[PDB]
Design a binder for these strands. Structure first.
Lengths: 231, 360, 74
RNA sequence: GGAGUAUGGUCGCAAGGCUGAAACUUAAAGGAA
């Protein structure tokens, strides 16, 4: 249906539909403070939202309107929440140097992570739920193995602070985007800098990956959207 | 080649009981109904272990691999290093040698290298607290089991060091006709290459179950790090109830799974502890074949042991039918007089057993 | 009796317990039930709460007491 | 009885590798240089 879902610094969750005019439905007062994350499941009947209200709320795609099943009462300033594409694992970043990975079905607190010294700015996990990447403002990437809750390798890169990281759905090869205006391409097995991009020169705020093709979309502070087609 | 056993069942038990008796055995038709019939790799690897500790033993394998001939030699021992194959953990190999430990010509200083835990076989803490205290009740005083490096599946790389220095002439004649009263619940919760917050969260599963019990609950958090923490990550807990009066210990264990909840596993083993205790009398179900043997190979005298019918399964009878085919010792079973429970006293005239090998 | 039901070889050990009520030893941990069945069983610990809380003639008595404990047994 | 020295015994004490160090070579910062 080409439906679009967005989040604000106001505690609200407004959607945009392309065949119609702009607004069909708006959630208002979903949270009190700013929300910071929004993840989509494989189906789409439930979304997960993470906010500065120390709350994580699920949102039920009723047919088309939204309601909540449960809320999650936490203690920290939630930044990114991501669900597994295998629909099993739900990772949550906090204000602390902690990543909590929850089971999807009953929220059993499967896992916790330590040792990062600065809060996690984006969480990824693989297509098959094997590797976790939790990039944070502490100038490094810590690649966590998802089987036993350990890391395989930490990785200092991207001088300023690392905003967004996303994966390739084919294999363990990922990108990295950061405030120091560099985009880098990595191995999930060799752990080496493959290809290093410098093109758009301000702070890289956003990143997205084509789900089959492999073109790379990045955003700047200075208003540039760069598309990197794979040869 | 005179006593013949059928099937690969209790294979490491049958090599032990032939070795102490000195009666030659021939175990034929091992896994004959398989697409890969015959022995496995580790069963061959275990036969290399008996050769290394006993000089004079003759071991013959037929070229179909299903028939194993073993004329036992005397227990020499000494110090050596056995490599454990990655199929079975090192606890599959520590457990038979404790039957051979107090009788060797020299000290057992045997170094084991490999994976140190699994689902089936005994962990290191299962032996250091569950089996070695059974040993001391029969008079094996200076017995130990040290941990150098701890491993975990699938790569392992862990090392234990079996050191047994008490070399006694026979196990003493045990009389335990009283169900021991549990004084404290001890335990070890270990973890390798993973987050140290698991171990306290493991214990929180265990202390959640036991809060209705009034005895001491203490679990030593054993967090491993560094090079002596083995290759592959993993964790596990081992819980031990004990009796202050005579030193009897009851235990249960399990390890972590590929994706397991550490709150559940700390809750699970404490349930498996109390389930084991509820079926128990003076031993555990996994400590009972170590003690059944030590009444048999104890000296020419009646021992007594208060055991429970819940322990008596199909597995327990196959233990008593391996002894009668070797040592020809009927195990008399009498009811107890306590009408609240179905305990029975297992009375065994021990076969008159010595040390062939120890020097004077 | 359980013992004369044990020492026969025509009986299977499956049948031995079925005669008594009316598995390989290679694995070390004996067969339990599932944690689903055990956690519901072990909500209460009240079933198991029953179990909690001259030198010469001395050493010659280690033999003499060992003698008549054979004799009352036989 | 005291003083002193020696001491392969029993018991206790302790060491080194910059810290930060999570299992990973890992930031901000500090220490030494």
């Amino acid at each position: 249906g080409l439906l679009v879902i967005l989040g604000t610094r106001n505690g609200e969750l407004q959607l945009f539909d392309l065949a119609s005019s702009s607004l069909l439905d708006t959630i208002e007062d979903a949270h009190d403070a700013a929300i910071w994350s929004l993840d989509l499941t494989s189906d789409g009947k439930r979304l997960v939202t993470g906010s500065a209200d120390k709350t994580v709320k699920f949102w039920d795609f009723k047919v088309l309107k939204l309601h909540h099943d449960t809320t999650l009462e936490l203690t920290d300033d939630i930044l990114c929440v991501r669900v597994s594409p295998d629909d099993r694992y739900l990772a949550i970043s906090l204000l602390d140097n902690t990543v909590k990975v929850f089971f999807l079905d009953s929220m059993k607190f499967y896992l916790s992570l330590y040792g990062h010294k600065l809060p996690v700015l984006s969480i990824d996990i693989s297509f098959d739920s094997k590797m976790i990447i939790t990039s944070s403002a502490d100038k490094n990437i810590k690649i966590w193995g998802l089987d036993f809750g350990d890391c395989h390798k930490s990785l200092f890169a991207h001088q300023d602070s690392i905003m967004n990281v996303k994966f390739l759905p084919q294999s363990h090869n990922f990108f990295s985007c950061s405030k120091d205006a560099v985009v880098k391409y990595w191995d999930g097995e060799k752990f080496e800098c493959i290809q290093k991009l410098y093109a758009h020169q301000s702070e890289v705020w956003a990143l997205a990956v084509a789900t089959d093709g492999g073109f790379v979309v990045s955003s700047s502070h200075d208003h540039s959207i760069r598309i990197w087609e794979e040869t | 080649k005179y006593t013949t056993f059928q099937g690969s069942q209790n294979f490491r038990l049958r090599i032990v009981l032939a070795t102490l008796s000195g009666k030659p055995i021939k175990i034929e038709k091992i896994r004959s109904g398989d697409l890969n019939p015959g022995l496995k790799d580790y069963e061959v690897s275990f036969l290399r272990l008996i050769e290394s500790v006993t000089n004079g033993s003759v071991i013959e394998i037929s070229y179909t691999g299903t028939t194993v001939i073993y004329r036992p030699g005397i227990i020499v021992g000494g110090a050596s290093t056995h490599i454990c194959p990655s199929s079975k953990p090192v606890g599959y190999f520590v457990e038979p040698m404790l039957y051979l430990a107090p009788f060797s010509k020299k000290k057992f200083s045997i170094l084991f290298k490999g994976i140190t835990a699994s689902h089936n076989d005994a962990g290191i803490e299962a032996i250091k607290w569950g089996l070695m205290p059974v040993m001391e009740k029969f008079g094996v005083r200076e017995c130990a089991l040290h941990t150098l490096k701890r491993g975990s599946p699938p790569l392992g790389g862990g090392e234990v060091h079996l050191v047994v220095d008490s070399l006694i002439a026979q196990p003493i004649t045990m009389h335990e006709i009283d169900r021991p009263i549990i004084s404290s619940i001890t335990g070890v919760a270990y973890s390798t290459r993973v987050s140290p917050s698991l171990v306290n969260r493991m214990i929180d599963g265990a202390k959640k179950v036991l809060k209705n019990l009034q005895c001491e609950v203490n679990i030593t958090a054993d967090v491993w790090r560094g090079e002596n923490s083995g290759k592959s990550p993993g964790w596990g807990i081992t819980l031990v109830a004990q009796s202050k009066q005579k030193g009897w210990s009851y235990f249960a264990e399990d390890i972590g799974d590929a994706g397991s909840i550490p709150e559940e596993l700390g809750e699970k083993v404490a349930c498996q502890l109390l389930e084991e205790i509820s079926k128990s009398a003076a031993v555990g179900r996994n400590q009972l074949p170590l003690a059944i043997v030590y009444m048999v190979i104890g000296k020419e005298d009646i021992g007594r042991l208060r055991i429970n019918k819940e322990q008596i399964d199909e597995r327990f009878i196959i233990l008593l039918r391996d002894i009668k085919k070797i040592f020809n010792t009927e195990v008399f079973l009498k009811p107890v007089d306590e009408a609240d429970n179905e305990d029975m006293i297992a009375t065994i005239k021990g076969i008159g057993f010595t040390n062939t090998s120890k020097k004077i | 009796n359980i013992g004369k039901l044990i020492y026969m070889d025509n009986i299977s050990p499956e049948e031995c317990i079925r005669r008594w009520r009316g598995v390989d030893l290679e694995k070390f941990v004996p067969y339990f039930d599932t944690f689903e069945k055990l956690a519901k069983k072990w909500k209460s610990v009240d079933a198991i709460k029953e179990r909690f809380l001259t030198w010469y003639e001395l050493q010659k008595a280690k033999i003499s007491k060992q003698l008549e404990i054979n004799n009352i047994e036989y």
